[PDB]
Amino acid sequence: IAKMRTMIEGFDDISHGGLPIGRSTLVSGTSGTGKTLFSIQFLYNGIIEFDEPGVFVTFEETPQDIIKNARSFGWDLAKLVDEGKLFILDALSALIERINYAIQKYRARRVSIDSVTSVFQQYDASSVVRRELFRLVARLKQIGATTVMTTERIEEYGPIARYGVEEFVSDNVVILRNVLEGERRRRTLEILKLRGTSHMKGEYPFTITDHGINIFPRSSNVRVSSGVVRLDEMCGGGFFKDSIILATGATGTGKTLLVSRFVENACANKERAILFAYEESRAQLLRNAYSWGMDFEEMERQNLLKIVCAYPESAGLEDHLQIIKSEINDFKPARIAIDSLSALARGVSNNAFRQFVIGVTGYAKQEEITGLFTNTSDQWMGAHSITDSHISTITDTIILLQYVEIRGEMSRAINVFKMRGSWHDKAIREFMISDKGPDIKDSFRNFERIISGSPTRI
Amino acid sequence: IAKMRTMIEGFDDISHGGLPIGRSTLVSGTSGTGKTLFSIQFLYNGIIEFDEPGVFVTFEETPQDIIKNARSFGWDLAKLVDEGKLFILDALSALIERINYAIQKYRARRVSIDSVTSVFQQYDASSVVRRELFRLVARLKQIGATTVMTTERIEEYGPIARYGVEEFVSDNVVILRNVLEGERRRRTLEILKLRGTSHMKGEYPFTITDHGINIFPLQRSSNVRVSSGVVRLDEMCGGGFFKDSIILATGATGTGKTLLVSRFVENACANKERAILFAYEESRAQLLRNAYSWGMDFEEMERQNLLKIVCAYPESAGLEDHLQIIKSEINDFKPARIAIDSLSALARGVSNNAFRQFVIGVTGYAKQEEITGLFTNTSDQWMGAHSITDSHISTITDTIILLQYVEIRGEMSRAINVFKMRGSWHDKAIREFMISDKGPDIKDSFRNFERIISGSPTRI
Amino acid sequence: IAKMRTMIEGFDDISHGGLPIGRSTLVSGTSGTGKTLFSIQFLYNGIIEFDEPGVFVTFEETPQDIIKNARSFGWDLAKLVDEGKLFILDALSALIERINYAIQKYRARRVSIDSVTSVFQQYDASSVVRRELFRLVARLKQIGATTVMTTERIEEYGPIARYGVEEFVSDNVVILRNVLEGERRRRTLEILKLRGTSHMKGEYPFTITDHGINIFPRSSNVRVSSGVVRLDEMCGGGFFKDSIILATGATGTGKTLLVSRFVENACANKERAILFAYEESRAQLLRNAYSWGMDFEEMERQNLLKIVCAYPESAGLEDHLQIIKSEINDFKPARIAIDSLSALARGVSNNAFRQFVIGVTGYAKQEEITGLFTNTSDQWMGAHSITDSHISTITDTIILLQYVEIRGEMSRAINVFKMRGSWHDKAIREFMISDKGPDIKDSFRNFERIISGSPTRI
Ligand SMILES: Nc1ncnc2c1ncn2[C@@H]1O[C@H](COP(=O)(O)OP(=O)(O)OP(=O)(O)O)[C@@H](O)[C@H]1O
Ligand SMILES: Nc1ncnc2c1ncn2[C@@H]1O[C@H](COP(=O)(O)OP(=O)(O)OP(=O)(O)O)[C@@H](O)[C@H]1O
Ligand SMILES: Nc1ncnc2c1ncn2[C@@H]1O[C@H](COP(=O)(O)OP(=O)(O)OP(=O)(O)O)[C@@H](O)[C@H]1O
Ligand SMILES: Nc1ncnc2c1ncn2[C@@H]1O[C@H](COP(=O)(O)OP(=O)(O)OP(=O)(O)O)[C@@H](O)[C@H]1O
Ligand SMILES: Nc1ncnc2c1ncn2[C@@H]1O[C@H](COP(=O)(O)OP(=O)(O)OP(=O)(O)O)[C@@H](O)[C@H]1O
Ligand SMILES: Nc1ncnc2c1ncn2[C@@H]1O[C@H](COP(=O)(O)OP(=O)(O)OP(=O)(O)O)[C@@H](O)[C@H]1O
Ligand SMILES: [Mg+2]
Ligand SMILES: [Mg+2]
Ligand SMILES: [Mg+2]
Ligand SMILES: [Mg+2]
Ligand SMILES: [Mg+2]
Ligand SMILES: [Mg+2]
């Protein structure tokens, strides 16, 4: 069974090539899931890429509203209709002939019907829909062209369609969802079945942007600096270019301090760096940075640093990934920083969060970008948190900052927890922050049980 | 697709400009969600901000009741009668004509219909509803005017409309909710879809006030330092706190959080500065006594119109309501610094999602108006450090003042330490402090003591 | 919009004045929720207070049963009907006229219809109810008098009414619930909406008594004694008159011993004290008390002590509050004692329990009553329990009793954990119980980690 490329970032890989050619695919989903955007994008790409004439049979919506609505993604369907590339037919076998005729009249290969559930209210009786639904499908496959039928849904986790019979008639079934968990929406796509072919099972996180749908389905020995010389000595000559570093520690340990020095070092070597803030504001970050002896304002003036401040609770994880990607695709940094991951995990699912980290890490490694992500531990024992963290198994380097109470004084300690394919210092060296940055000193030799955060004289 | 500024506090940002031009927006919700209120506000602002002629089509309620109902928000009906900028049509295509007629009879632009679910009593079939709903939105778009059709729902988490078909006919869908979790209602508005445009997905906390709906959508940083009330505490923070900064004092029950809040507010009024104290644990009567027992006359500071106390039981109103109160109270008095006693009193019997959205708002607004916020929180463990790390609101704060009990020689002594100070140097020593009739007396730290963070140290 | 006072303890504050005048309020709820009791109480109060003639339109019930049923709250509707103050009309616009006529014939201002859901079985068809329901409402508001319509419900957390359309017709909606959680009923009232006015949102705990419905929506420096001189020295001269004391400790620490001495001290100063027991029985309490050297039997003979023994598992929290209040309103004590709160929290919700403590504390402070509540900790570390307790943040004084194992002997220790707006001793003094009460001795000076319950020689 040949598959027809839809040129939809993700769907191509999820459908193992695309949609079965000569057959009809059903895209069911609730209101605002993006059933019309998909059907349009399936046609547009078809004419904008392989130049394969395509017809869109409208119903509840008009040929003007569709074009005007398609303008949101910067598309000109009028020019596509002015060149006879696309045909929008306004709207019981009078339609089947009109489509069969129009298709042959414009030598069409890709058709989209949005929606059939609209023109079935006068029928109902469940079995009535089926018989009329089956006839259409047969009248399509007989013509020999591939389509993507649109169907309405009531529940996100209920019947496939409205009459729960359209799925058994259609050859391929794609379900568009928009689940609401914790007052936060999430668009997920899934291929229920693909008769006479293979596909990726389960749901995949997607978003809607000006580009349209965005379904989200080497190892060089080159070392880079972190901004701190002592830390580079502890990492056996700084981090790797194509590596993921992780700074985990208690609140106010110095995660943001290390990120500031990591971003500065990029801009100091005339290299672009993107800082994704989710805890502090640009105003505060600029002040805090300057207090340590770093002019972030200057770094933005040299077009070598871009601060992307935003609230984690605002947008969803799926959207946050689309932002970093787009922002990374535009500025094209040498190294990025996420401050922090703990701010993006609160009020989120462990499953939906794991997929975020995989994407950011994978993309960062795919574009050969040195990513330094931070994370605030939920326990006073940093080691316990790092071991309890499922994102710590994915990171290549782990910088652990731990509070150590010594002589009734809350001192701080830093240690390179792990360093993949590179020697690192295994000593828990103490450090003190000043008006110039970190000052990594010696490691507590005459103390025991320092991992608890409260050592004892040996 | 041109938008239409509804002038609704929040919706403008949530809708990325407002509602699509010459398009039909559906506002579904249960009874008491505020569909009619929203519908009135939409038109009201239209002919009181941009002079936009709009008509309100009624069905269940009459032109007098509606006009009388808007009297709770101080809105007169002189715009619909004397002025003639409004039009209340008392109440299948017999009405559509009148809508268009009146529209062109005042060069219309904004329309509001409440409710369209009530004009389908005769018809019980969903198919019929769609057909009539479809032709309505069709004509409307043909005329070219911003319509805000209002429908009703049965479940807060179920069908979009009563017949679950109106959402597919309408171009835009807005769902007003009023969820009840733990015998407490929560009004949340959400934009389901906006055909041919972008918007904020998911539901946003809103409240209904005398000004109507109050939707709450989700470089300064000066180095100017302010005093906390305690001299030694200012020396421990490297010259007092920051002006536009959030401070948090966590500790076991009876550690001295309220004592620190009392000096923070006193110091304000001492420099002829206004300070609002938000109480949620003790009452004014009690607070005045304890305050005076520490050597502070809060009654005096209230007499100088410099201090205000807003006592209220947490377990009564919703977090969104508390947020609306603080804002309004801060917008009225306009203080230099505020105090919340406490965040733990407002966290009990609330969701971590709903509670984190609160602190973000208060912190955000406090910093957005350059107000020094001293928030407190009673720790649920005897190891204060554990609780601070466990706290997902401890990362949000700029300064953290940790108070913790320390058993020494079979005596329950207390210790204070500046856990962290964002973009500032602070003392890293756990100095013991005592409380008396003059207030806190920060002493020295414990040199020959180990495992002090445990609450029960050992002689070194 | 003017509001009409219903003289219902609570509703006045929950409705911010009362019910919208010239409009109709809908009181929906299940069977036994108290829809008829409310409607009657709305009329009675109207004639017994502002003397505003009122008419009750009955249906399934008769004008005799209603009066006989109203006798339970000690009301004489016959005398109200014998004076032409109330009119009970026995029982499709023949009724609207009968009401419109009768109302004007008796110059009525308050009307009650129980129930409309009864006279709608022959109609049904959902939309039919609406049209007939809307007509009634319009025929009422036109007359210009305020009402409280009664409607039946199926589920406690489901449709507002039976046809789920009455809520959209009515101007104001009040829902009476009777939720069953853990084989225990709880009556909650709520104002869904109030068109053209403000109200308290969410549900409020209410009960039914002989008084009818019972919706439940200074700081002097005067010090009082606890019965123990050493404890008064540790509290800087005893507790405050308008203060809440809390005795938290492990089972058999001496909570009941301290409560006995606290109640005795009241009766010793010719002051009335109420002891609310929930763990031990009067028989046992009398014996235990006498064993320490206190004649509680004598204290009851002097009309200075009243023991209110009851089982927590019997009645609900809402009811327990109504008892203390009524019992406090009758005897009018100087100081009360709850033994204990831990007995009233088992098999209850943390939310429904927090509201109980607020009420008892608030009322105790409103009537200037010194309340000493006890609580049995669920851990061996008293400090951990006090910190973990959400009721410990509301109490003004916290007396912590902790078991301390010394020299293979289970000794006991007492300490004033906190004392609001008063100096207190910060020493963990040991104590031993004898045949005369508590003997607070010195504090363990040569021991460390005593808070664990198992110290160590220093
Ligand atoms: N340019 C854009 N930028 C951002 N978001 C957009 C943009 N255009 C559309 N959207 C979002 O994506 C959605 C796409 O709606 P679409 O018309 O595809 O809905 P549908 O699934 O066909 O629904 P219906 O059942 O009403 O036909 C919009 O409702 C909006 O939330
Ligand atoms: N100018 C300064 N001089 C000395 N120490 C400073 C200075 N500025 C900040 N610090 C120290 O740095 C700490 C904050 O570091 P940073 O904000 O990087 O920590 P973090 O762990 O990233 O914080 P958060 O918990 O907010 O994410 C402060 O608590 C303080 O102890
Ligand atoms: N001044 C006010 N202060 C506080 N709350 C108010 C005020 N005015 C109105 N409200 C609240 O807002 C509600 C307004 O009801 P509204 O008419 O907006 O409801 P609706 O969603 O249109 O209901 P319906 O199902 O009858 O159409 C009141 O019930 C009340 O809860
Ligand atoms: N006049 C006083 N003299 C001495 N100590 C006092 C005096 N007033 C209060 N205290 C001390 O202060 C404690 C209460 O301080 P404060 O109320 O500020 O603490 P908190 O942490 O806010 O407690 P809560 O858990 O009640 O909110 C008392 O337990 C006592 O130790
Ligand atoms: N004097 C009383 N003392 C205690 N409880 C009482 C007393 N009188 C009534 N009750 C309780 O309150 C309830 C009040 O019943 P009421 O007649 O108000 O029911 P209703 O909600 O109108 O129900 P229905 O749907 O049957 O009309 C009684 O069923 C009983 O449980
Ligand atoms: N006559 C007595 N002489 C000495 N000790 C006594 C005497 N009577 C009781 N006790 C001590 O008092 C303890 C009980 O005290 P009390 O009943 O007040 O404790 P409690 O903590 O309130 O109990 P509960 O856990 O049942 O609530 C007994 O375990 C015993 O050790
Ligand atoms: Mg569509
Ligand atoms: Mg940080
Ligand atoms: Mg309405
Ligand atoms: Mg306090
Ligand atoms: Mg009844
Ligand atoms: Mg006892």
PDB file of N, CA and C in Angstrom, chain A residues 31-32 65 69 118 121 152-153 162 180 183-185 251 279 283-284 287-288 346-347 378 380 403 405 407-410 412, chain B residues 23 127 130 164-165 167-168 186 190 193 201-204 220-221 356 367 385 390 395 398 419-420 423 428 430 446 451-453:
ATOM      1  N   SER A  31     -14.566  20.050  19.184  1.00  0.00           N
ATOM      2  CA  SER A  31     -14.553  21.416  18.597  1.00  0.00           C
ATOM      3  C   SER A  31     -13.285  22.158  19.034  1.00  0.00           C
ATOM      4  N   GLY A  32     -12.501  22.642  18.064  1.00  0.00           N
ATOM      5  CA  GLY A  32     -11.244  23.384  18.288  1.00  0.00           C
ATOM      6  C   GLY A  32     -10.030  22.470  18.325  1.00  0.00           C
ATOM      7  N   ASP A  65     -14.859  32.282   4.242  1.00  0.00           N
ATOM      8  CA  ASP A  65     -14.470  32.110   5.667  1.00  0.00           C
ATOM      9  C   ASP A  65     -13.247  31.189   5.754  1.00  0.00           C
ATOM     10  N   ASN A  69      -9.827  32.295   7.078  1.00  0.00           N
ATOM     11  CA  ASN A  69      -9.344  31.518   8.251  1.00  0.00           C
ATOM     12  C   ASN A  69      -7.942  30.966   7.960  1.00  0.00           C
ATOM     13  N   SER A 118     -22.043  17.020   9.901  1.00  0.00           N
ATOM     14  CA  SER A 118     -22.948  18.185   9.704  1.00  0.00           C
ATOM     15  C   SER A 118     -24.131  17.790   8.812  1.00  0.00           C
ATOM     16  N   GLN A 121     -27.852  15.050  10.032  1.00  0.00           N
ATOM     17  CA  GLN A 121     -28.782  15.386  11.131  1.00  0.00           C
ATOM     18  C   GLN A 121     -30.199  14.937  10.750  1.00  0.00           C
ATOM     19  N   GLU A 152     -17.199  14.788  13.917  1.00  0.00           N
ATOM     20  CA  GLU A 152     -17.349  15.477  15.227  1.00  0.00           C
ATOM     21  C   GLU A 152     -17.356  14.425  16.343  1.00  0.00           C
ATOM     22  N   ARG A 153     -16.919  14.814  17.545  1.00  0.00           N
ATOM     23  CA  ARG A 153     -16.883  13.958  18.761  1.00  0.00           C
ATOM     24  C   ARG A 153     -17.476  14.729  19.944  1.00  0.00           C
ATOM     25  N   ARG A 162     -19.617  10.459  16.435  1.00  0.00           N
ATOM     26  CA  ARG A 162     -20.889  10.885  17.074  1.00  0.00           C
ATOM     27  C   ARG A 162     -21.840   9.685  17.164  1.00  0.00           C
ATOM     28  N   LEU A 180      -8.264  18.335  28.919  1.00  0.00           N
ATOM     29  CA  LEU A 180      -8.115  19.438  29.905  1.00  0.00           C
ATOM     30  C   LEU A 180      -7.814  18.830  31.280  1.00  0.00           C
ATOM     31  N   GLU A 183      -6.835  22.557  34.546  1.00  0.00           N
ATOM     32  CA  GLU A 183      -7.221  23.835  33.887  1.00  0.00           C
ATOM     33  C   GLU A 183      -6.231  24.174  32.766  1.00  0.00           C
ATOM     34  N   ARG A 184      -5.623  23.159  32.144  1.00  0.00           N
ATOM     35  CA  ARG A 184      -4.608  23.317  31.068  1.00  0.00           C
ATOM     36  C   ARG A 184      -4.929  22.345  29.927  1.00  0.00           C
ATOM     37  N   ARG A 185      -5.140  22.880  28.720  1.00  0.00           N
ATOM     38  CA  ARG A 185      -5.462  22.095  27.498  1.00  0.00           C
ATOM     39  C   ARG A 185      -4.174  21.499  26.926  1.00  0.00           C
ATOM     40  N   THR A 251      16.992  25.594  47.185  1.00  0.00           N
ATOM     41  CA  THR A 251      16.632  26.979  46.781  1.00  0.00           C
ATOM     42  C   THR A 251      17.733  27.931  47.270  1.00  0.00           C
ATOM     43  N   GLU A 279      11.524  31.515  36.530  1.00  0.00           N
ATOM     44  CA  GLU A 279      11.443  31.762  37.996  1.00  0.00           C
ATOM     45  C   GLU A 279      11.557  33.266  38.270  1.00  0.00           C
ATOM     46  N   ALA A 283      14.233  42.019  34.563  1.00  0.00           N
ATOM     47  CA  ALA A 283      14.567  43.139  35.473  1.00  0.00           C
ATOM     48  C   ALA A 283      15.459  42.628  36.610  1.00  0.00           C
ATOM     49  N   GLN A 284      15.000  41.598  37.328  1.00  0.00           N
ATOM     50  CA  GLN A 284      15.702  41.006  38.501  1.00  0.00           C
ATOM     51  C   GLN A 284      17.003  40.336  38.043  1.00  0.00           C
ATOM     52  N   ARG A 287      19.782  42.677  37.339  1.00  0.00           N
ATOM     53  CA  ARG A 287      20.268  43.231  38.633  1.00  0.00           C
ATOM     54  C   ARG A 287      21.161  42.197  39.327  1.00  0.00           C
ATOM     55  N   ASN A 288      20.650  40.973  39.514  1.00  0.00           N
ATOM     56  CA  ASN A 288      21.365  39.848  40.177  1.00  0.00           C
ATOM     57  C   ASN A 288      22.698  39.603  39.461  1.00  0.00           C
ATOM     58  N   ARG A 346       5.988  21.329  38.143  1.00  0.00           N
ATOM     59  CA  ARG A 346       4.897  21.650  39.103  1.00  0.00           C
ATOM     60  C   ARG A 346       3.571  21.779  38.342  1.00  0.00           C
ATOM     61  N   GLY A 347       2.542  21.054  38.793  1.00  0.00           N
ATOM     62  CA  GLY A 347       1.199  21.031  38.183  1.00  0.00           C
ATOM     63  C   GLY A 347       1.219  20.392  36.806  1.00  0.00           C
ATOM     64  N   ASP A 378      13.552  18.943  46.003  1.00  0.00           N
ATOM     65  CA  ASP A 378      12.396  19.015  46.941  1.00  0.00           C
ATOM     66  C   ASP A 378      12.787  18.430  48.305  1.00  0.00           C
ATOM     67  N   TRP A 380      16.369  18.125  51.321  1.00  0.00           N
ATOM     68  CA  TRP A 380      17.605  18.782  51.822  1.00  0.00           C
ATOM     69  C   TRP A 380      18.831  17.930  51.474  1.00  0.00           C
ATOM     70  N   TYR A 403      23.678  22.383  50.589  1.00  0.00           N
ATOM     71  CA  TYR A 403      23.855  23.166  51.840  1.00  0.00           C
ATOM     72  C   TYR A 403      24.520  22.275  52.896  1.00  0.00           C
ATOM     73  N   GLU A 405      25.706  22.621  56.950  1.00  0.00           N
ATOM     74  CA  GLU A 405      25.758  23.351  58.246  1.00  0.00           C
ATOM     75  C   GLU A 405      27.074  23.005  58.953  1.00  0.00           C
ATOM     76  N   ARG A 407      29.710  24.520  62.099  1.00  0.00           N
ATOM     77  CA  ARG A 407      29.966  25.426  63.253  1.00  0.00           C
ATOM     78  C   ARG A 407      28.795  26.406  63.414  1.00  0.00           C
ATOM     79  N   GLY A 408      27.559  25.907  63.300  1.00  0.00           N
ATOM     80  CA  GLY A 408      26.320  26.708  63.370  1.00  0.00           C
ATOM     81  C   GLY A 408      26.265  27.768  62.283  1.00  0.00           C
ATOM     82  N   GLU A 409      26.832  27.466  61.110  1.00  0.00           N
ATOM     83  CA  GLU A 409      26.850  28.353  59.916  1.00  0.00           C
ATOM     84  C   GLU A 409      26.435  27.533  58.690  1.00  0.00           C
ATOM     85  N   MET A 410      25.440  28.019  57.943  1.00  0.00           N
ATOM     86  CA  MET A 410      24.934  27.379  56.701  1.00  0.00           C
ATOM     87  C   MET A 410      25.921  27.657  55.564  1.00  0.00           C
ATOM     88  N   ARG A 412      27.901  26.238  51.947  1.00  0.00           N
ATOM     89  CA  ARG A 412      27.452  25.594  50.683  1.00  0.00           C
ATOM     90  C   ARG A 412      28.604  24.747  50.141  1.00  0.00           C
TER      91      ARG A 412
ATOM     92  N   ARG B  23     -18.203  38.168  13.316  1.00  0.00           N
ATOM     93  CA  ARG B  23     -18.254  36.707  13.594  1.00  0.00           C
ATOM     94  C   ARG B  23     -19.113  36.456  14.838  1.00  0.00           C
ATOM     95  N   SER B 127     -30.678  17.773  15.811  1.00  0.00           N
ATOM     96  CA  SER B 127     -30.607  18.035  14.348  1.00  0.00           C
ATOM     97  C   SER B 127     -31.318  19.349  13.999  1.00  0.00           C
ATOM     98  N   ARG B 130     -29.364  22.542  15.450  1.00  0.00           N
ATOM     99  CA  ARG B 130     -28.230  22.817  14.523  1.00  0.00           C
ATOM    100  C   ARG B 130     -28.741  23.637  13.334  1.00  0.00           C
ATOM    101  N   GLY B 164     -25.283  19.829  22.483  1.00  0.00           N
ATOM    102  CA  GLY B 164     -23.924  19.468  22.030  1.00  0.00           C
ATOM    103  C   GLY B 164     -23.811  19.476  20.514  1.00  0.00           C
ATOM    104  N   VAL B 165     -24.061  20.634  19.898  1.00  0.00           N
ATOM    105  CA  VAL B 165     -24.059  20.830  18.415  1.00  0.00           C
ATOM    106  C   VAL B 165     -23.820  22.312  18.075  1.00  0.00           C
ATOM    107  N   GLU B 167     -21.618  24.375  19.394  1.00  0.00           N
ATOM    108  CA  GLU B 167     -20.150  24.631  19.373  1.00  0.00           C
ATOM    109  C   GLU B 167     -19.608  24.436  17.951  1.00  0.00           C
ATOM    110  N   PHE B 168     -20.143  23.463  17.205  1.00  0.00           N
ATOM    111  CA  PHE B 168     -19.680  23.086  15.843  1.00  0.00           C
ATOM    112  C   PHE B 168     -20.207  24.089  14.809  1.00  0.00           C
ATOM    113  N   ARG B 186     -15.655  27.948  42.281  1.00  0.00           N
ATOM    114  CA  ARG B 186     -14.528  28.625  41.592  1.00  0.00           C
ATOM    115  C   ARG B 186     -14.959  28.950  40.159  1.00  0.00           C
ATOM    116  N   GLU B 190     -12.767  30.142  29.973  1.00  0.00           N
ATOM    117  CA  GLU B 190     -11.846  29.483  29.012  1.00  0.00           C
ATOM    118  C   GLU B 190     -12.346  29.721  27.584  1.00  0.00           C
ATOM    119  N   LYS B 193     -12.184  27.642  21.360  1.00  0.00           N
ATOM    120  CA  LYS B 193     -11.599  27.825  20.007  1.00  0.00           C
ATOM    121  C   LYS B 193     -11.894  29.243  19.509  1.00  0.00           C
ATOM    122  N   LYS B 201      -5.116  28.897  25.472  1.00  0.00           N
ATOM    123  CA  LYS B 201      -5.828  27.617  25.740  1.00  0.00           C
ATOM    124  C   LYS B 201      -5.839  27.363  27.252  1.00  0.00           C
ATOM    125  N   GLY B 202      -6.851  26.639  27.745  1.00  0.00           N
ATOM    126  CA  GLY B 202      -7.049  26.320  29.175  1.00  0.00           C
ATOM    127  C   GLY B 202      -7.859  27.390  29.888  1.00  0.00           C
ATOM    128  N   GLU B 203      -8.272  27.118  31.131  1.00  0.00           N
ATOM    129  CA  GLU B 203      -9.239  27.949  31.903  1.00  0.00           C
ATOM    130  C   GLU B 203      -8.472  28.889  32.839  1.00  0.00           C
ATOM    131  N   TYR B 204      -8.974  30.120  33.012  1.00  0.00           N
ATOM    132  CA  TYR B 204      -8.343  31.195  33.823  1.00  0.00           C
ATOM    133  C   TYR B 204      -9.308  31.656  34.914  1.00  0.00           C
ATOM    134  N   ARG B 220      12.869  47.144  35.842  1.00  0.00           N
ATOM    135  CA  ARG B 220      13.086  47.953  37.073  1.00  0.00           C
ATOM    136  C   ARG B 220      14.188  47.299  37.915  1.00  0.00           C
ATOM    137  N   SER B 221      13.807  46.516  38.932  1.00  0.00           N
ATOM    138  CA  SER B 221      14.714  45.858  39.911  1.00  0.00           C
ATOM    139  C   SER B 221      15.749  46.869  40.418  1.00  0.00           C
ATOM    140  N   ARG B 356      -0.697  27.828  43.864  1.00  0.00           N
ATOM    141  CA  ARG B 356       0.517  28.367  43.189  1.00  0.00           C
ATOM    142  C   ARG B 356       0.120  29.525  42.266  1.00  0.00           C
ATOM    143  N   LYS B 367       5.214  43.266  42.961  1.00  0.00           N
ATOM    144  CA  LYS B 367       6.445  43.701  42.245  1.00  0.00           C
ATOM    145  C   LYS B 367       6.068  44.667  41.116  1.00  0.00           C
ATOM    146  N   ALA B 385      14.184  23.473  57.294  1.00  0.00           N
ATOM    147  CA  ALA B 385      14.950  23.350  56.031  1.00  0.00           C
ATOM    148  C   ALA B 385      14.228  22.400  55.066  1.00  0.00           C
ATOM    149  N   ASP B 390      10.683  21.617  50.403  1.00  0.00           N
ATOM    150  CA  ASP B 390       9.372  21.010  50.041  1.00  0.00           C
ATOM    151  C   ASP B 390       8.441  22.083  49.462  1.00  0.00           C
ATOM    152  N   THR B 395      10.907  28.995  46.060  1.00  0.00           N
ATOM    153  CA  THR B 395      11.721  29.325  44.862  1.00  0.00           C
ATOM    154  C   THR B 395      11.306  30.700  44.330  1.00  0.00           C
ATOM    155  N   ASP B 398      12.308  36.041  46.958  1.00  0.00           N
ATOM    156  CA  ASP B 398      13.668  36.598  46.728  1.00  0.00           C
ATOM    157  C   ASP B 398      14.514  36.386  47.987  1.00  0.00           C
ATOM    158  N   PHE B 419      18.103  32.284  55.140  1.00  0.00           N
ATOM    159  CA  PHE B 419      18.287  31.075  54.296  1.00  0.00           C
ATOM    160  C   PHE B 419      18.907  31.471  52.950  1.00  0.00           C
ATOM    161  N   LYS B 420      18.362  32.506  52.299  1.00  0.00           N
ATOM    162  CA  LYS B 420      18.858  33.023  50.993  1.00  0.00           C
ATOM    163  C   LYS B 420      18.494  34.506  50.843  1.00  0.00           C
ATOM    164  N   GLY B 423      20.422  38.311  44.737  1.00  0.00           N
ATOM    165  CA  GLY B 423      21.214  39.477  44.292  1.00  0.00           C
ATOM    166  C   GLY B 423      21.619  40.379  45.447  1.00  0.00           C
ATOM    167  N   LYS B 428      25.338  33.840  56.897  1.00  0.00           N
ATOM    168  CA  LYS B 428      25.055  32.390  56.721  1.00  0.00           C
ATOM    169  C   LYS B 428      25.100  31.696  58.089  1.00  0.00           C
ATOM    170  N   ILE B 430      23.435  30.727  61.868  1.00  0.00           N
ATOM    171  CA  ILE B 430      22.151  30.438  62.574  1.00  0.00           C
ATOM    172  C   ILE B 430      22.254  31.025  63.986  1.00  0.00           C
ATOM    173  N   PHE B 446      25.558  29.178  67.309  1.00  0.00           N
ATOM    174  CA  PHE B 446      25.985  28.030  68.151  1.00  0.00           C
ATOM    175  C   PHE B 446      27.254  27.414  67.548  1.00  0.00           C
ATOM    176  N   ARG B 451      24.177  19.335  63.990  1.00  0.00           N
ATOM    177  CA  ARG B 451      22.813  18.855  63.630  1.00  0.00           C
ATOM    178  C   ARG B 451      21.761  19.797  64.230  1.00  0.00           C
ATOM    179  N   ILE B 452      21.956  21.112  64.089  1.00  0.00           N
ATOM    180  CA  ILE B 452      21.024  22.166  64.596  1.00  0.00           C
ATOM    181  C   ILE B 452      19.768  22.184  63.714  1.00  0.00           C
ATOM    182  N   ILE B 453      19.920  21.879  62.420  1.00  0.00           N
ATOM    183  CA  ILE B 453      18.815  21.821  61.412  1.00  0.00           C
ATOM    184  C   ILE B 453      17.797  20.746  61.822  1.00  0.00           C
TER     185      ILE B 453
END
